Amino acid sequence: MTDQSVRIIEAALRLYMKKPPHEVSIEEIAREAKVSKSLIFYHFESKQKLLEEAVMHAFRKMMEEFNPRSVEEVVDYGIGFIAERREFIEFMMYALSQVRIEELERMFGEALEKVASLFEGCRHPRETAIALMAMLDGLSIYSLYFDLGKLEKYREIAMEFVES
């Protein structure tokens, strides 16, 4: 994509990270991107169209950057997400609702193929991979409602599960 469109998306993502995505205006994105409102309109049809493109761009970079060389590195990635600022975790959850079900299934399949591969030789590699991912995702949802405690205690539990 164009240098201008990249800057607009990065400026938007930076604002979506801090506040609820729908509450971010074109004036705020223009101010954060250091560009006019007419230039944002020239690249994006509306606030919603820009949000969808920003969501797909965030997820495209996140799948390309998820290549765990070990089962321990999958726990680290999971715990790393739980340790993010609340607003980051909520943005990512709202981002999942702004993607097509087929595109969400594709991403999960690509992630599970990499995780189940790290469990090659285990009793049920696919089912263990799904159980680990389910726990890490569950704990990130839970973090939005309760103070879970010392995150390194969850990392230890996850590692004691992982190498049994």
The single residue listed with the structure tokens 């969850």 is 154
Work out the number of other CB atoms within 10 angstroms of the CB of residue 108: 12
116 binds a second copy (CB under 8 A): no
93 binds a second copy (CB under 8 A): no
Q: Rounded to the nearest whole angstrom, what is the least distance from the CB of residue 55 to a second copy in the complex?
A: 18
Please name the residue ranges forming H helices in 44-150: 47-64, 71-82, 86-97, 101-118, 125-143
| Residues composing the chain | 164
22 binds a second copy (CB under 8 A): no
| Segment interacting with a second copy (CB under 8 A) among 34-42, 43-51, 62-70, 136-144 | 136-144
145 binds a second copy (CB under 8 A): yes
Contacts to a second copy from residues 37-76, by CB under 8 A? none
